[PDB]
Amino acid sequence: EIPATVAAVKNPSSKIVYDEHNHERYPPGDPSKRAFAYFVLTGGRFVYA
Amino acid sequence: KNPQDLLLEAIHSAGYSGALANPLLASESALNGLNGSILEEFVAENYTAPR
Amino acid sequence: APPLDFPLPGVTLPSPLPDHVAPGKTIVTTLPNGIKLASETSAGPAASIGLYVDCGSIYETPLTFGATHLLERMAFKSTRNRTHFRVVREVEAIGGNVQASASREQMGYTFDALKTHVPEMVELLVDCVRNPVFLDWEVNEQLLKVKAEVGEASKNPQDLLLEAIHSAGYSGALANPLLASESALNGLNGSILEEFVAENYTAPRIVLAASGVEHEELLSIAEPLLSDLPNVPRPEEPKSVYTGGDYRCHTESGHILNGQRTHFALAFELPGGWHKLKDAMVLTVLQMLLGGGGSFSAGGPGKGMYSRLYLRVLNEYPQFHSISAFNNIYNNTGIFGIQVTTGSDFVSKAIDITVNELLAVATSGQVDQVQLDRAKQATKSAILMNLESRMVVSEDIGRQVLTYGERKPVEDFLKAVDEVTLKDIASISQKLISSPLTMASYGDVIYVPNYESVSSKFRS
Amino acid sequence: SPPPPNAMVYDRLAEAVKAKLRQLENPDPRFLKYGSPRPTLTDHTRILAAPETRVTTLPNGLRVATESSLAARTATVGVWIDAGSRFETEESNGTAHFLEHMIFKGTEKRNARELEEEIENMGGHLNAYTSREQTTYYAKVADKDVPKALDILADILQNSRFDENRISRERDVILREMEEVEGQTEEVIFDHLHATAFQYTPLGRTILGPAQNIKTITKDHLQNYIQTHYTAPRMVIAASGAVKHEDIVEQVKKLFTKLSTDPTTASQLVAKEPAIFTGSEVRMLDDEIPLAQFAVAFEGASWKDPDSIALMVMQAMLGSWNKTAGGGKHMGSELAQRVGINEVAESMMAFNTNYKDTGLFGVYAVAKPDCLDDLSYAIMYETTKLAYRVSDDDVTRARNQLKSSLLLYIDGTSPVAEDIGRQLLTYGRRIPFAELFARIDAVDASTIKRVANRFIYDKDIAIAAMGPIQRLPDYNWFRRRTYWNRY
Amino acid sequence: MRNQRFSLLKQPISSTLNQHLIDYPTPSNLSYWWGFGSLAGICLVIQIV
Amino acid sequence: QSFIDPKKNWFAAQHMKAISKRLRRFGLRYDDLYDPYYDLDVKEALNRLPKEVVDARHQRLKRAMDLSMKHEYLPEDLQAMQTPFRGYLQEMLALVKREKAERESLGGLPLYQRTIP
Ligand SMILES: [Zn+2]
């Protein structure tokens, strides 16, 4: 029985699973939501001014 | 800093073959295989009533 | 700009070279002060210029020990005309590469850039070798790196041994160590290096060698800058004798517990090394004939998979992990031997399995004539493939006008490998074992034999 | 009664420092005539002549390219294939590397010992290497054994046998080759970087494959790989040295007659399974290791992209510093001056990889665990500055260095032939030396900022780290510093 | 110290603010009940102004 | 220029002996007044000097901080043995400043920077 952290440095698999209890992921092959994330943060920086 | 027990140990390894060539003050690698259970059963075997 | 599968429109294209460009011949010129400029053209777009000096690690009296391992680290630094910041920025401005190396008999400084930059490449190379100031704050920061690498040299046990088959074995100059110890790094400063160079870097000991430069260009640049060095008498060459010797060092006290293993080696001697030309080419054939390797390297058809030390040692004794021959030829003496690692519980017979093989080639019938032809084909091609680089070519014009005063054509090297027969392999290897046995060891030293236990198994 | 200036040891040790400094004051103007520390841009047209590269396409689709140099005494000839690890299916993931080691062992005409002896009797060599998209088999011989060398490469690529006694003895050579490349730590960083940047794509897999795949692979699989991929439109025969073009063409027209005939090209296989970049990270913490290693990467350009030449000029601006180097504190690159002056790393290196559809651009570094904050600040500060503020001496020096390093590398018969064979597979042609120099100096300070704004500015990154890395900053620290909230 | 400068928040003029208000190490599972302490320092500034 | 040379001017040969008089009573040289905390270039010129020359500077500075705590001067036997204006620092400091003016005209980061207080 190999340690779990030892058997993960020896096998670089390209199928990674994250924790999906709080956030679901956009499926691979989608654009980034960077422009939407800027315009929500502007309409509150309007308010603090 | 004691070159008369450096030499007196070196006239002992070079010169004998078996038991009398075992060093008295040991080196760095045999201090890494030693622990409290090596000392414990070395004494339970070699410290007996006829000795 | 178009994508890279479509050609760009508006560019001039040079007209190509023919399919058979005739090769050039080496031109050598001797100046009145004794310096020798040597040039040869080529068919690439790049040049390679080097400067080679006769000095080395055998000219080291006991006041200047370690003073050529440090001259390799002080190489392209502050001069009387340029700071160390201007030297680094001038080499990077043209995209060059600069390098130095030190031997027991030769020092060498090299440069290579494109052929457009030949007048720049020459005057930086001459100024960095002819006019070094040695400033104490630059020397002290190079000493502190040599002191932190003599802290550990125990991770290369084939130059630990190869230096230990040289001190034990010689007496005078050839026993001077190349990479020095901790105490001779404490007597060294910027004035020891300064007068070691003003004494040992003279005009009859300097050769400039170019590869890819026309000979009349190299004289318009390098002559007005080297002609006024003074003509001095050369010194007398340092002498030594080949005695025998034994050496052993039980390894540093942390290397074992299923760890150090074993590293031993043997050696011999043969009086001339390069001024007796006929004998040295026999021994290079005998090196590829014996050969061998570490055998867990996985290349291909190639290096040594059908040598004597391969299919008669490692192919049936799996306890070996390395066995190979080695030659260290110099200018009059020479050294031939065999380096082995094995296990600690499999050691003393590995001296046995080693020695017979040196006894097998001393016999006149054990070697085939199908084994001799393989070692003479694998030797002529190794010389020919290695000479394709422009850097090996310039290094050949340097170290041959320091030994013969002229460059020997490569046709005379392929002519004299043809002549070797099955009896020259036997006679010179019988003149090899007539000299005392040099032995060295490292690792677990306790389980090995001693000098006279082995040396009387040969002759004397 | 003042002491004379030789009487005290400290007074006459000070007249010897003033005499060492008076020989730094009178420079010789004949040693300063050609060299200059300011970079300029120059013309290299007179020296750029070369022999002619002749390409010939056979009617089955096979291409034969040569560069002849008839005054030499050696030659290099080999086969370049457009196939690799990307074109497998995760149940055959180690196949193209296993087939490489099992191709010098077969051949009904010559067994393993006979093939090994024919090469060594001539005095030649025979190599092979695999990558994720390309395979090579080539040989270095003398000029009179070129027809024998080409006879062996055609027979081991067409008529190889794979027997079970040889297959199972190669399963223990490769399973021990895996174990030694688990301890190099530069091939381990760059292998976890590909698995996290190109996850759920075929470009993310490793070349050697999982260890369970290797003990399962049998001849069945080796033979469908060599009948699906090794076909005539995806193969290039390249020779360089003392060869003649018209004599090699007639040899390959009668030796290569029996390879397969599937009409699938490589571009139909890249387009139905493309490669997609993802911003993500992997961190492997151990704390018993003394040094830490990591790499941070942006997405880059493909092979035929016109912006590829500008991502090679930019890589020469970031530079490389090592602790043994003679440049020291005086290097051209400003990232190498930050690392070098403050001693915040052991070594630093910028990389740039190209592929058929994607690429990778970044920096790799090795350092001590208490230096990881000031090193990560300096790396991110100088990469983002390429999108804002580019000096003109920076690009002239980085253009002079890329011109010189691409040509100083082509030295001998084997660097020439791998230049021909690899460029016919990626560009479809060999680019002459005068066009390639003309595309390099068309990259000025305004071109740098425009490609930096496309690839670097406000973009996702991928990180892989290993060692005592508890003091390396986290992902939100790195992602924020891809832009400057100050200009 | 180092030999030349770096991030300006690691300078002596802003070290006491960096190591106590920006880079200060905090347990990662703190809930919203750990928020009423900075809220009480805002209520004290409102009363003074 | 022309108003500072004391062997041509008369009011510069009286400004010269006024500082020479005041330096002898503490046994100081004019270069001991250069502080490595005022100018970071003075810190570098002192690291390139031999250890025996910097050690005599640290001992002249300690002898003088002891004379001013006690409110006294050197005795006039020791005052005739003093050499102010015998320098050890000006040539090495001009070299460090000349190397810094070359690293700025050619691009290149500074080798040492001042900490911001
Ligand atoms: Zn392999």
CSV table of N, CA and C in Angstrom, one decimal, chain F residues 12-30 79 82-86:
chain,number,residue,atom,x,y,z
F,12,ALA,N,42.0,81.8,1.3
F,12,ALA,CA,41.9,80.3,1.3
F,12,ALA,C,43.0,79.6,2.1
F,13,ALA,N,44.1,80.4,2.3
F,13,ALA,CA,45.2,79.9,3.1
F,13,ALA,C,45.0,80.2,4.6
F,14,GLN,N,44.0,80.9,4.9
F,14,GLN,CA,43.5,81.1,6.3
F,14,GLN,C,42.3,80.3,6.6
F,15,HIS,N,41.5,79.9,5.6
F,15,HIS,CA,40.4,78.9,5.8
F,15,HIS,C,41.0,77.5,5.9
F,16,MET,N,42.2,77.3,5.4
F,16,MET,CA,42.8,76.0,5.4
F,16,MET,C,43.4,75.7,6.8
F,17,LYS,N,44.1,76.7,7.4
F,17,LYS,CA,44.7,76.5,8.7
F,17,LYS,C,43.7,76.6,9.8
F,18,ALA,N,42.5,77.1,9.6
F,18,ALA,CA,41.5,77.1,10.6
F,18,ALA,C,40.9,75.7,10.8
F,19,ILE,N,40.7,74.9,9.7
F,19,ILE,CA,40.2,73.5,9.8
F,19,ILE,C,41.3,72.6,10.2
F,20,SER,N,42.6,72.9,9.9
F,20,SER,CA,43.7,72.1,10.3
F,20,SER,C,44.0,72.3,11.8
F,21,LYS,N,43.7,73.4,12.3
F,21,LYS,CA,43.9,73.6,13.8
F,21,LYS,C,42.8,72.8,14.6
F,22,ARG,N,41.6,72.9,14.1
F,22,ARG,CA,40.5,72.2,14.8
F,22,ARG,C,40.5,70.7,14.6
F,23,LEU,N,41.1,70.2,13.6
F,23,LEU,CA,41.1,68.7,13.5
F,23,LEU,C,42.2,68.1,14.3
F,24,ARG,N,43.3,68.8,14.5
F,24,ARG,CA,44.5,68.3,15.3
F,24,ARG,C,44.1,68.1,16.8
F,25,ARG,N,43.2,68.8,17.4
F,25,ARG,CA,43.0,68.7,18.8
F,25,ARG,C,42.2,67.5,19.1
F,26,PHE,N,41.4,66.9,18.2
F,26,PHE,CA,40.8,65.7,18.4
F,26,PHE,C,41.6,64.5,17.7
F,27,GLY,N,42.6,64.8,17.0
F,27,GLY,CA,43.4,63.8,16.3
F,27,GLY,C,42.7,63.2,15.1
F,28,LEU,N,41.9,63.9,14.4
F,28,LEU,CA,41.1,63.4,13.3
F,28,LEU,C,41.7,63.8,12.0
F,29,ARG,N,41.4,63.0,11.0
F,29,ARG,CA,41.7,63.4,9.6
F,29,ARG,C,40.4,63.9,8.9
F,30,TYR,N,40.5,64.6,7.8
F,30,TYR,CA,39.3,65.1,7.1
F,30,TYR,C,38.4,64.0,6.6
F,79,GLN,N,49.9,66.2,19.5
F,79,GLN,CA,49.3,67.1,18.5
F,79,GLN,C,50.3,67.5,17.4
F,82,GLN,N,50.3,64.7,14.3
F,82,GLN,CA,49.0,64.5,13.6
F,82,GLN,C,49.2,65.0,12.2
F,83,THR,N,48.6,64.2,11.2
F,83,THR,CA,48.5,64.6,9.8
F,83,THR,C,47.1,64.7,9.4
F,84,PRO,N,46.4,65.8,9.5
F,84,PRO,CA,45.2,66.0,8.8
F,84,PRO,C,45.5,66.2,7.3
F,85,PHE,N,44.5,66.1,6.4
F,85,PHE,CA,44.6,66.2,5.0
F,85,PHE,C,45.5,65.1,4.3
F,86,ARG,N,46.0,64.2,5.0
F,86,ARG,CA,46.6,63.0,4.4
F,86,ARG,C,45.4,62.0,4.2
